[PDB]
Amino acid sequence: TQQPIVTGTSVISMKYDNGVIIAADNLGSYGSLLRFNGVERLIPVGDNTVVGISGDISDMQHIERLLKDLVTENAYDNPLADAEEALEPSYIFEYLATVMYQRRSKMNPLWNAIIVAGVQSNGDQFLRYVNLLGVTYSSPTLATGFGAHMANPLLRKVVDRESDIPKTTVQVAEEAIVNAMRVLYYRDARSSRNFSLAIIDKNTGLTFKKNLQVENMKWDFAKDIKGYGTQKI
Amino acid sequence: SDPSSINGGIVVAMTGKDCVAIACDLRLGSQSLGVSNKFEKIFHYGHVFLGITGLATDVTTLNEMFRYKTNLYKLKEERAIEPETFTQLVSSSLYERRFGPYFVGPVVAGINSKSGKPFIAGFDLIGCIDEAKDFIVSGTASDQLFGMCESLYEPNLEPEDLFETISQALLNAADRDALSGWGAVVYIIKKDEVVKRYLKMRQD
Amino acid sequence: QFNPYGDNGGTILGIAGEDFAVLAGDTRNITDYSINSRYEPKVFDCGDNIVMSANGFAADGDALVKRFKNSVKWYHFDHNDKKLSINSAARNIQHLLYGKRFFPYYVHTIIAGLDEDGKGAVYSFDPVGSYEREQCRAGGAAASLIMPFLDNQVNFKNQYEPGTNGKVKKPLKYLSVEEVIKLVRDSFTSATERHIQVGDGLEILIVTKDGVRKEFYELKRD
Amino acid sequence: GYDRALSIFSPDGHIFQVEYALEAVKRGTCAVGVKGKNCVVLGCERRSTLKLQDTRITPSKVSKIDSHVVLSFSGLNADSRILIEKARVEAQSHRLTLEDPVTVEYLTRYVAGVQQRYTQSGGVR
Amino acid sequence: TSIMAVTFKDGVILGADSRTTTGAYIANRVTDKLTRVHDKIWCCRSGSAADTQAIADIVQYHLELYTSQYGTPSTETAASVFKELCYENKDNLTAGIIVAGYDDKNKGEVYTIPLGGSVHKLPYAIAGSGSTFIYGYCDKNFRENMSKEETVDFIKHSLSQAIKWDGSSGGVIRMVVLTAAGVERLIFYPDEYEQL
Amino acid sequence: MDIILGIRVQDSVILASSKAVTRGISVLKDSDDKTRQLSPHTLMSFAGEAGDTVQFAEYIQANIQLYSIREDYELSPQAVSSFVRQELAKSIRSRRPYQVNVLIGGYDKKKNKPELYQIDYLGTKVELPYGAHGYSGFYTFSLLDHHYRPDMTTEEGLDLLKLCVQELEKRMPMDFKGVIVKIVDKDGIRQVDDF
Amino acid sequence: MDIILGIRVQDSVILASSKAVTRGISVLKDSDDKTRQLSPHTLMSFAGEAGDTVQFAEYIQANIQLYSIREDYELSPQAVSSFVRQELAKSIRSRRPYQVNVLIGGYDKKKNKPELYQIDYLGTKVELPYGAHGYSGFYTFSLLDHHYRPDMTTEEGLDLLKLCVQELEKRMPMDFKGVIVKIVDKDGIRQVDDF
Amino acid sequence: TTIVGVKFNNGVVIAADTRSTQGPIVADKNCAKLHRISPKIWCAGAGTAADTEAVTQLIGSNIELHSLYTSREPRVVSALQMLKQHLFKYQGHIGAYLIVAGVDPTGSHLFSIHAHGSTDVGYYLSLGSGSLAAMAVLESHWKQDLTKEEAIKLASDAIQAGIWNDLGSGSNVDVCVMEIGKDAEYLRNYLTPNVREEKQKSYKFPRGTTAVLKESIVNICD
Amino acid sequence: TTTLAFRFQGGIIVAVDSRATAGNWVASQTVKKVIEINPFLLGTMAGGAVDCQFWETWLGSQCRLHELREKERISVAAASKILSNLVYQYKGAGLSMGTMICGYTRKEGPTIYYVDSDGTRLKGDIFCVGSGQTFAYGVLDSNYKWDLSVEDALYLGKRSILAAAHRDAYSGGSVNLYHVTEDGWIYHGNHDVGELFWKVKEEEGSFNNVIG
Ligand SMILES: *[C@@](C)(CO)[C@](*)(O)[C@H](CC(C)C)NC(=O)[C@H](Cc1ccccc1)NC(=O)[C@H](CC(C)C)NC(=O)[C@H](CCc1ccccc1)NC(=O)CN1CCOCC1
Ligand SMILES: *[C@@](C)(CO)[C@](*)(O)[C@H](CC(C)C)NC(=O)[C@H](Cc1ccccc1)NC(=O)[C@H](CC(C)C)NC(=O)[C@H](CCc1ccccc1)NC(=O)CN1CCOCC1
Numbered sequence A: 001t002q003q004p005i006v007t008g009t010s011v012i013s014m015k016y017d018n019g020v021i022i023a024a025d026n027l028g029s030y031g032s033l034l035r036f037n038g039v040e041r042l043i044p045v046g047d048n049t050v051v052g053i054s055g056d057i058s059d060m061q062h063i064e065r066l067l068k069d070l071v072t073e074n075a076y077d078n079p080l081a082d083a084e085e086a087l088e089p090s091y092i093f094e095y096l097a098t099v100m101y102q103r104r105s106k107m108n109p110l111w112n113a114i115i116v117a118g119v120q121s122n123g124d125q126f127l128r129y130v131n132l133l134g135v136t137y138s139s140p141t142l143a144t145g146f147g148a149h150m151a152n153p154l155l156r157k158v159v160d161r162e163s164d165i166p167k168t169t170v171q172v173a174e175e176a177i178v179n180a181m182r183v184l185y186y187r188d189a190r191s192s193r194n195f196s197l198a199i200i201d202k203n204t205g206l207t208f209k210k211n212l213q214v215e216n217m218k219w220d221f222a223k224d225i226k227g228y229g230t231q232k233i
Numbered sequence B: 001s002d003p004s005s006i007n008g009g010i011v012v013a014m015t016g017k018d019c020v021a022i023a024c025d026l027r028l029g030s031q032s033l034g035v036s037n038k039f040e041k042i043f044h045y046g047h048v049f050l051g052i053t054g055l056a057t058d059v060t061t062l063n064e065m066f067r068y069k070t071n072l073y074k075l076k077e078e079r080a081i082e083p084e085t086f087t088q089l090v091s092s093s094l095y096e097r098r099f100g101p102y103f104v105g106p107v108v109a110g111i112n113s114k115s116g117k118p119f120i121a122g123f124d125l126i127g128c129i130d131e132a133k134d135f136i137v138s139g140t141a142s143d144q145l146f147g148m149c150e151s152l153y154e155p156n157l158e159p160e161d162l163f164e165t166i167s168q169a170l171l172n173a174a175d176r177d178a179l180s181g182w183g184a185v186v187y188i189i190k191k192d193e194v195v196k197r198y199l200k201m202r203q204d
Numbered sequence C: 001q002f003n004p005y006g007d008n009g010g011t012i013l014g015i016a017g018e019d020f021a022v023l024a025g026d027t028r029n030i031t032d033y034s035i036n037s038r039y040e041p042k043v044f045d046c047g048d049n050i051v052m053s054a055n056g057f058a059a060d061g062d063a064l065v066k067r068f069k070n071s072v073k074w075y076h077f078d079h080n081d082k083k084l085s086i087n088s089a090a091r092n093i094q095h096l097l098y099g100k101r102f103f104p105y106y107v108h109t110i111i112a113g114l115d116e117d118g119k120g121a122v123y124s125f126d127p128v129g130s131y132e133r134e135q136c137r138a139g140g141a142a143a144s145l146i147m148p149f150l151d152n153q154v155n156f157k158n159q160y161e162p163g164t165n166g167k168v169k170k171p172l173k174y175l176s177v178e179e180v181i182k183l184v185r186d187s188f189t190s191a192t193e194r195h196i197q198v199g200d201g202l203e204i205l206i207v208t209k210d211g212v213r214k215e216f217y218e219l220k221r222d
Numbered sequence D: 001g002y003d004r005a006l007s008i009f010s011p012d013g014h015i016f017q018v019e020y021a022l023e024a025v026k027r028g029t030c031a032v033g034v035k036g037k038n039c040v041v042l043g044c045e046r047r048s049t050l051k052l053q054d055t056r057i058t059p060s061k062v063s064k065i066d067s068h069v070v071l072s073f074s075g076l077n078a079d080s081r082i083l084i085e086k087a088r089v090e091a092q093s094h095r096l097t098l099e100d101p102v103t104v105e106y107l108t109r110y111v112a113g114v115q116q117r118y119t120q121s122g123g124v125r
Numbered sequence E: 001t002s003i004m005a006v007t008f009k010d011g012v013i014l015g016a017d018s019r020t021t022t023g024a025y026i027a028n029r030v031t032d033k034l035t036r037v038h039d040k041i042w043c044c045r046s047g048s049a050a051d052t053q054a055i056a057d058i059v060q061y062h063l064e065l066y067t068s069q070y071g072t073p074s075t076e077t078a079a080s081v082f083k084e085l086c087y088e089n090k091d092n093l094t095a096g097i098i099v100a101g102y103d104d105k106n107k108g109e110v111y112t113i114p115l116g117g118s119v120h121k122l123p124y125a126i127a128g129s130g131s132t133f134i135y136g137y138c139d140k141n142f143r144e145n146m147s148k149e150e151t152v153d154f155i156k157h158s159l160s161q162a163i164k165w166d167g168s169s170g171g172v173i174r175m176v177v178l179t180a181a182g183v184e185r186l187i188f189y190p191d192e193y194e195q196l
Numbered sequence F, G: 001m002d003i004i005l006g007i008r009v010q011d012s013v014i015l016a017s018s019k020a021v022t023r024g025i026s027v028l029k030d031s032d033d034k035t036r037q038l039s040p041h042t043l044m045s046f047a048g049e050a051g052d053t054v055q056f057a058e059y060i061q062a063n064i065q066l067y068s069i070r071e072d073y074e075l076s077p078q079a080v081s082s083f084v085r086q087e088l089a090k091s092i093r094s095r096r097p098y099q100v101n102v103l104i105g106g107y108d109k110k111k112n113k114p115e116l117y118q119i120d121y122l123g124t125k126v127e128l129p130y131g132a133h134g135y136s137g138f139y140t141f142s143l144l145d146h147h148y149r150p151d152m153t154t155e156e157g158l159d160l161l162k163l164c165v166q167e168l169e170k171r172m173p174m175d176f177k178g179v180i181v182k183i184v185d186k187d188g189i190r191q192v193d194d195f
Numbered sequence H: 001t002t003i004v005g006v007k008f009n010n011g012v013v014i015a016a017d018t019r020s021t022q023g024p025i026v027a028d029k030n031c032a033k034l035h036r037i038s039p040k041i042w043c044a045g046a047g048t049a050a051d052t053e054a055v056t057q058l059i060g061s062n063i064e065l066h067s068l069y070t071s072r073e074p075r076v077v078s079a080l081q082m083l084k085q086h087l088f089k090y091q092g093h094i095g096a097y098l099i100v101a102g103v104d105p106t107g108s109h110l111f112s113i114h115a116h117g118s119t120d121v122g123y124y125l126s127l128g129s130g131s132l133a134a135m136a137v138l139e140s141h142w143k144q145d146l147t148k149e150e151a152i153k154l155a156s157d158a159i160q161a162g163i164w165n166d167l168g169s170g171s172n173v174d175v176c177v178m179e180i181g182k183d184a185e186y187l188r189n190y191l192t193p194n195v196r197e198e199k200q201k202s203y204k205f206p207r208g209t210t211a212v213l214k215e216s217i218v219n220i221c222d
Numbered sequence I: 001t002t003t004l005a006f007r008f009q010g011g012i013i014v015a016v017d018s019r020a021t022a023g024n025w026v027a028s029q030t031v032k033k034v035i036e037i038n039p040f041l042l043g044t045m046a047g048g049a050v051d052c053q054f055w056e057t058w059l060g061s062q063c064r065l066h067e068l069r070e071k072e073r074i075s076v077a078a079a080s081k082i083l084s085n086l087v088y089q090y091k092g093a094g095l096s097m098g099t100m101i102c103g104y105t106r107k108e109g110p111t112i113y114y115v116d117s118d119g120t121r122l123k124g125d126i127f128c129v130g131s132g133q134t135f136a137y138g139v140l141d142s143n144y145k146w147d148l149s150v151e152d153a154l155y156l157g158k159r160s161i162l163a164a165a166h167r168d169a170y171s172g173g174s175v176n177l178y179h180v181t182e183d184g185w186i187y188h189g190n191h192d193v194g195e196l197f198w199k200v201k202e203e204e205g206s207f208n209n210v211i212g
């Protein structure tokens, strides 16, 4: 039995025609206090997988170490560690899913919501979710926390079902993700303006973008809003 | 100690072609103990029919209350109350007890004597009107009734066909609920004739 | 305080014919008032012509299916590739569930297939392992909606022969695979209308002596 | 714990420790059992090189396992006490769970099973 | 919330963020927490949105009725009416209000009224959840008899930090300037204040 | 308080009520009459919370007697039962409700019919051929379902009632010290002294 | 379980134990013997939590019988009571204690004296001329304080015991369905069949 | 519920879904959540259904009496003030969450009211369980100087977001357009994107299927 | 549940209902509440369904192991005590079981043992177990005699379950009958309450509370 202390908010993601996109802001909140601002919550595993983590940061750092150690262990007595026997997104996910469910079953969970985004060796897009309860699910768009409530509706307008994935380009997909991150900054009280974004493409590979900022924000209309009902000044 | 499921019981109402049906089970119990198999839950004030599920004392009290009010209505208005009007009266009366409510699930059914239109309506315990073209359900087997009605129901049924549909909806719903059953009554209501039928059902 | 359980919604439905059996389930996966996935299958082919679904808390559902699938694998290893009969599978599943009697799998489990006489079989389990063979069973969130409809349409309950004064019952008979699929589709569209956790898609697994076939149908997405 | 396999097979297929245990029995005082038509009688030898004995308190050769079953023996006296004790405990345990006293065959089968266990358990003779 | 009121040479300036929250959801990102109870008597609202609105509305009614009979009320009088409501109904209120006004005799005045319903007359006042993070900064930087531009910068820099650290604060920085000249509304957007 | 039974037969209503008054680990009395005559042809038995039972019974008794004097006329059992139900229905939403369950056995002189009404503390009224309150019903209802016939005589009803009391004396945990039996018919109310 | 009594007289110990086994609102049995013979001259009655009572009684019985076979000798009532007390004293600080109260009536053959021991589930032992467990004591102790004499015969003890049972049948709330009476003396243990 | 309000050039538009729930059960598939306070002041209500209806009718009644008393068309701020003071008095126990909008001699207005009595002002607002889905759309597509047709599109799109993504919302989209100098147009079932598909089978029973015990004519006449 | 079993001149009658509930939800009307342990032993089930089902089929395995080891069918006393000692180990853990072990052996004759989940074990001639036990007792006790015929005893057992099925909301479905003799148990059919109630009402003239 735990309670989360230092926390990370929404992780959002979606599939597009050649791969997957995933994003998460760089904030480590301490309750209402916006304590840490240089926190990277997207963690690449190899050149084909990115694990996005929300929830307790101490448990996130533990998971980082497990993934780091998984890469080391996979390399042992493995001449094809950088080829046919490299770590797949599906292997990494299933490992995490096993751990999450084992920990919830011992009544001592890793207090996290996790999205594993990547591209399989055969080119297939991989995007699957797992959380502190060991619950798992997959969808063309996946999001955690407030992202589930606000990002998914926006991302589902682009990719509403499986057949919409081949029709969605990386330009359109990234635009929707970046727009969603702005909406979350407007509306989530534990979000920051700064964020990271990762693209895993079956052709161009892993592109990790750091120090992005929410921009093109609408605030001008605020000047016209006076009082809370009557008041004219 | 959940007032709405101490005594048990169910009511269902349906519309058809120039007709309406309202049906109810006959059980009154005290939790596991079945007490009465004659406890009817449908009443009528003129041509307007009211079914009431939930706490049996409140079922009785509200019947007596609406008889009281519809009688005064008729004396002053010099005409029988209509289903649409009665529905509003039920809603007002229930909401009057907003923070000390009657633990009931009433269902209005009837045909407007002027327009000839079939009318049904349902309420929650504090008076929210739930109007419906097709059907209204209420009671301890409301989930079961929702499932039965949603699948079995079709629009514009003739009075004789509508009888079969509503009866099968109630019977099969009641048999999946421990606190409902022990007999059943069905009212088939046409513009100027009303038929009341008692159904044969399993007595466990 | 940490709550180890959750509700992933959805509903499942098993019907048995004369020489076949179907196990249906919607593909919607939810938590609270949010949709997690519109297509997340929870009806699985477990081998030996046994299909299985464990509906409720998905983490426990997957864990169970995973363990039973593994049980089928080891049954082959330990008993010279012998086919696991549906009755033997059912008893095995009881022990899986009851093994966690004091920290239960939060699921309604249903399996379907053929018995050793080639006839359609459906077995259903409570969360802690009590099981029963039936012609008919609905499980999950909309079970209370669908089940009475099945009593009426599959087992002809409360239906008497017209004109016999309610004395002669409507005689029991096996339904064709065409008629069963009609009842499954109507059951799920009705459940979708009146239950918020049910919708998106319907996936049916049909089991005959020839193997396991699949059928998919769209459901309302609201 | 002491683990040594003391009872083991020899080239000719004999377990010498079990066979040497029989020699201890052969050394022990003679015991005889004769069953009649409606009774059983257990006779036992007591060696007469021991005078100045106190026969009131000296352990008797025949022991009651329950009110209806008796056990005599030949061989090591100290070893017999362990078997008798176990047998007496099992007798009461049987009455407790089966609500019926042991049969003579059952009690024998138990005692025999104990003896066997000591022929292929590590660290024991 | 993060709110503050600061007296200066020509009068007083009120300042506030624009965030209203339900848990961690921002129900309103363009809220106006600076409210008029009289021509040149305003207040900053923190705590329950419903309670502070209900209080402000009653105070505005009282001061309007006061004005009809006895002419313009003092800022002290306005603070007293706020206090009376907050103190007598302390069991049923969650309201932290800063009252600020401009007399011609008394010039700029600031009164703060915390949860208990006590009254405290100060040179400047800070309040709301985000105020905790700027006690150190404001104490070190506040000076009496500042100019308009210095006071605007003081409030802007202060609320900028409060907003930066407090999750319950954000959006735009609204300000209201109270002087003999009149009433001036100011607004400052994230793109400006965030990078201070 | 605990056991109150009622059986309506062809020409009468028979009420049986336990004699025990128990408090803590002491049976304080074994001859308690848990009934009040409301009118010459109407009898009410009662069971429930201590104090409430008698206070309620006598309050109803006074009201019915007041009515009888005012109108020089006896209220029908149906009318009395409706009056009692309404009082309990008021009571349940009071500051302190009457925790009293009652049976009303009456003979309607206008209809020439016996009538038995069962009313609980919530104000839940039902007319029945046979009734019970508390745990008694869990044994007696099934027993009466089997042995009861609507055309029975008063003597047959008393034998049917003996069968109930015997079953209760066999299977009930508590010693209720037997019952006082009273009969309501066209000639009024009388007590059976040897039961 | 409920009523267990014990009376030590001149030459014997008399134990009386109620026959009722009640669960919920049903008397499941009315002929239950709440006692076990531990040895030919030692009898133990018991009352308390369902399941625990018999499980404990039989466990003690097995142990005493085991001792008797091992030593070919009967333990004194004092020795048996001390063994039982220690078991309960261990039990009370266990994960799940035996919720069982007992009376041990025995005849010491070496002393030629009857002995009655009262032991509760905590392991509280006392030797007494007369004893009781549960609510029974609240009536019987004062009654025996008055009527008991140390030099009474077995027949006088049975009449004294009848007086207790009558009082309990009068004033106890629950129907305990009479008692099984057993006598422990120099000739062993025997049951009184007509009580 | 999902409810929204959007301001435009010459007025204001409000919209709502039409699902009414009872736990996880859809009680009403087409209920009206748009309420008329006065001819040109309309209200969208979320929360406790009886409370939203009762509070909107009470204030609507008092607004009519006020209008007749003052010989003036009612103002939105009057409805706003009367609603909030009523709701505040009851300390949130009256679970009415309202979006109040309309046109009056002062102009066009858009407000929201919460159960505890707090009011908000905005150009775009959303309330109810699906408000986050709706607000996401509103935050993504809203701009200053919307036309009538653009505001209707934006409003209905925001409701749709709730319909599809929120389990608490569903069925149809109701709209009401309040433009200055014109009559308010109430567009009941403006969109119906959740029509029930044809059933696979007719469940019309053969006449005489149900077993009957008694028949009798009921007297409704005097 | 409602279950009963009573001893009489011609052996043992065992009768049970077939309903299974989850709160007020009627989950099944066709549950087998009698377990056939061997040709001479029966077990009845009431309480938690799998607790009963699991441990009573486990009991059957233990009884089989006894007759393999001892070359003799287990006694009713010993069989009941295996179950009672098992549940006693789980005492406090929350098992919910009300069972009756009924059977015949040479040394015992016809024997019935009541065994429940708090460790109570009782030999007796009549027992009714379950939520509707009191309803069954009312009819059974008032009509019971030792000298009942096999035909009358079977009917009384059936009629007692019917009585409980009717009044108890958590009993119903159908009646399963068994008769135990010196030759073993004999099944006497599944009797649906749907038809049985009306058949009994008409032929017997009882159930006058119900609208005919
Ligand atoms: C900062 C945020 C904190 O100091 C500011 O002070 C602002 C003040 C401005 C807006 C005037 N405060 C808030 O935004 C305020 C924070 C708050 C919340 C609860 C108690 C005190 C202060 N937020 C509110 O008042 C919101 C406004 C609504 C969303 C328009 N109201 C709520 O959150 C209400 C509060 C009800 C209440 C509780 C205790 C005392 C008084 C009122 N709660 C809900 O609506 C219930 N909500 C349902 C969903 O589950 C979470 C709870
Ligand atoms: C979306 C769906 C959710 O936000 C919308 O907000 C809609 C608003 C529209 C319909 C105006 N909200 C609902 O549909 C609303 C959701 C809800 C439920 C319960 C509490 C608060 C909100 N549903 C209702 O209000 C239903 C109305 C239907 C048509 C009957 N009412 C109930 O479910 C009532 C609750 C009444 C209540 C009393 C006291 C305090 C709060 C609420 N509940 C029942 O009827 C349940 N039960 C039935 C059996 O008898 C006992 C009562």
Ligand SMILES: *[C@@](C)(CO)[C@](*)(O)[C@H](CC(C)C)NC(=O)[C@H](Cc1ccccc1)NC(=O)[C@H](CC(C)C)NC(=O)[C@H](CCc1ccccc1)NC(=O)CN1CCOCC1
Pocket: C101, C104, C126, C127, C128, C130, I001, I002, I019, I020, I021, I022, I023, I027, I031, I033, I045, I046, I047, I048, I049, I050, I052, I096, I130, I131, I170, I171
């Ligand atoms: C009469 C009919 C009533 O008691 C009998 O006693 C029968 C005995 C027969 C079946 C052997 N008893 C029941 O039917 C019994 C009643 C009961 C329920 C719970 C505890 C004790 C007694 N019912 C069950 O055991 C049902 C079995 C059927 C197949 C549904 N099982 C449940 O209710 C399960 C498991 C309950 C449980 C016991 C111990 C630990 C954990 C759980 N619970 C659910 O299925 C939960 N529920 C189903 C509906 O969907 C929401 C979740």
Ligand SMILES: [Cl-]
Pocket: A228, E020, E031, E032, E033, E049, E053, H119
């Ligand atoms: Cl505000």
Ligand SMILES: [Mg+2]
Pocket: B203, B204, I164, I165, I166, I167, I168, I169, I170, I171, I172
């Ligand atoms: Mg029943």
Ligand SMILES: [Mg+2]
Pocket: C221, C222, H162, H163, H164, H165, H166, H167, H168, H169, H170
């Ligand atoms: Mg939806």
